[PDB]
């Protein structure tokens, strides 16, 4: 209670999630693509506002969330997802941060996954997908070749960099007072209003 020990305050983590979610929502992205935006835009915001090296990574990811294991992998003969089960996260200043975590309720049906922050030391990582016995446990296997290929066409898409710029400029550290909505201009020169999405967000894994 006497210092900020985590890389980012919980409330600011939620600000980041809210900003990225607000920019993405119109895109109706699949889970894998969504994680790519949460991880790259999150990393960019961390670089720009917190002055830490923050690196998006992807591959196989698994979490114990309140007793249920969420597994971003394909089952075969588990392996790294060849499709929509691929998942990205951020590694920054030793911290594992998954800015997508509040969105884990979607697509999990019976698992009834709550929306909470995921920000934990990488040094706390479990040994495997079979070592996830406690809520908040996580396991990652980076697949750098797969990650590189997944992102291969992103540099050709000017809109993505434009959205990242908007994200970094929308985010402010608490308590400074963020715009409720922004006017965003596309490459055609046309502007649209993008509002902050409106979920109430509490809790940490």
Which keywords apply here?
monomer; Atu2299-like; two-stranded antiparallel sheet; 4 helices; Structural Genomics; mcsg; six-stranded antiparallel beta sheet; Protein Structure Initiative; alpha+beta; 8 strands; structural genomics, unknown function; 205 residues; PSI-2
What does this structure look like?
This protein has helices at residues 10-24, 31-50, 144-150, 158-170, and strands at 54-65, 68-72, 87-92, 95-97, 119-121, 138-142, 181-185, 191-195. It is an alpha+beta fold. The protein has one domain (1-205): Hypothetical protein Atu2299 (Atu2299-like), CATH 3.10.550.10. Strands 1, 2, 3, 4, 5 and 6 form a 6-stranded antiparallel sheet that branches. A two-stranded antiparallel sheet has the order 7-8. Strand 3 (87-92) and strand 4 form a beta hairpin. The PDB classes it as structural genomics, unknown function. The entry lists the keywords ATC2257, mcsg, Structural Genomics, PSI-2, Protein Structure Initiative, Midwest Center for Structural Genomics, unknown function. The assembly is monomeric. The crystal structure of genomics APC5867. The protein: Hypothetical protein Atu2299.
């Amino acid at each position: 209670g006497y210092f900020e020990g985590m890389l980012i305050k919980q409330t600011d983590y939620f600000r980041i999630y809210r900003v990225i979610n607000s920019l993405l929502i119109s895109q109706n992205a699949d889970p894998a693509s969504a994680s790519m935006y949460f991880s790259t835009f999150g990393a960019f915001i961390l670089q720009q506002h917190y002055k830490v090296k923050a690196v998006p990574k992807g591959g196989l990811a698994a979490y114990n969330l309140g007793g249920t294991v969420l597994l971003f992998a394909d089952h075969r003969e588990y392996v790294t997802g060849a499709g929509e089960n691929f998942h990205c996260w951020v590694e920054a200043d030793g911290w594992a941060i998954d800015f997508m975590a509040p969105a884990f309720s979607e697509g999990t049906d019976a698992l009834a996954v709550p929306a909470k922050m995921f920000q934990r030391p990488l040094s706390a990582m479990a040994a495997s997908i079979n070592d996830l016995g406690q809520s908040g446990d996580f396991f990652y296997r980076s697949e750098p070749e797969a990650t590189a290929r997944r992102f291969a066409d992103w540099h050709k898409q000017a809109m993505i960099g434009d959205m990242a710029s908007v994200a970094a400029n929308w985010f402010r550290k608490s308590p400074k007072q963020m715009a409720a909505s922004l006017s965003v201009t596309d490459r055609d020169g046309k502007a649209r209003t993008v509002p902050l999405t409106g979920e109430m967000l509490t809790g940490a894994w």
